[PDB]
Design a protein around this ligand. Sequence first.
Ligand SMILES: CNC(=O)c1ccc(C)c(Nc2ncnc3c2cnn3-c2ccccc2)c1
Length: 326
Amino acid sequence: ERPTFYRQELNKTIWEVPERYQNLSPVSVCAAFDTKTGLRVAVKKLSRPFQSIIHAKRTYRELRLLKHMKHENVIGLLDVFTPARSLEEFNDVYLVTHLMGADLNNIVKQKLTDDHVQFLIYQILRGLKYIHSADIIHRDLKPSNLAVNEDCELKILDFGLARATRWYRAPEIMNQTVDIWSVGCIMAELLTGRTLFPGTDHIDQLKLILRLVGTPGAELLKKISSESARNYIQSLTQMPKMNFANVFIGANPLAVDLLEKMLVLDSDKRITAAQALAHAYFAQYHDPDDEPVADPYDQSFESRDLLIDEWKSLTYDEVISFVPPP
Ligand SMILES: CNC(=O)c1ccc(C)c(Nc2ncnc3c2cnn3-c2ccccc2)c1
């Protein structure tokens, strides 16, 4: 059943993919045209998957996450292959998914309207609800990993991997509700057309957040876990909480209300993804019978810290067991 593979040097690196995929353009990920289906697909060649214990762990995980995620707003695994004829020769991993048109970055890079924002944000939260129900958090949600086609059909890209960029990072990590932070941060940029928090360093970044959220309450200040973090909030002046109505001039009262529940430092009281889907701003789009949860994701492998070869062998095994989706 093994097909013929073919080689090419793209941007200083060799791609050994099957015959089925032609015209590879670097979009490292490639925009390849698929001959069997005749569609445009994205092919990802993994960067030194087994050239460290961490790269290897990262490698297995990503494949485990992909062989699992089946949601219309969560990029799915179409194909997984290796030039490898054997486990002993297994050094390269490739993952195949549908190609998208644009990331939410270039979309605004021209400001977005209300129904446009409602449908982009509804979907972002719809995908999380699934990622979240499989006991997974994205941790690095940003415009560059939310992808859409012409039809505004949205996909959550690069979840559960990664661990200028701080822009969308929840302050308690600078629980699942860390991506809700990123959501509200993305929702703001779509409504205005500006980065809400374009901070230059980890100190600046917090000062901007606090300059809008307000300095934490004496209740929240007692709650905080870091001595250095608490002692840094004290070191800073007392900012009040800014009226979002005055910051987001002209928005749907429910959009501004929505962000109030998205930009809250109390990580225990912040809006969850599922909660946000039921909020008044989404009513036209909201469907409780069409907002699914994920089939339990067995992630016991996470508590295990093996050697390169034990991971590689596991990454090899999962490439074998694959049944492509129809
Ligand atoms: C946890 N691993 C992933 O999420 C993962 C793993 C493997 C692949 C191949 C992908 N897929 C993509 N990676 C990067 N850019 C992508 C896609 C798909 N479309 N676009 C895109 C196309 C045009 C414009 C902007 C973006 C994701």
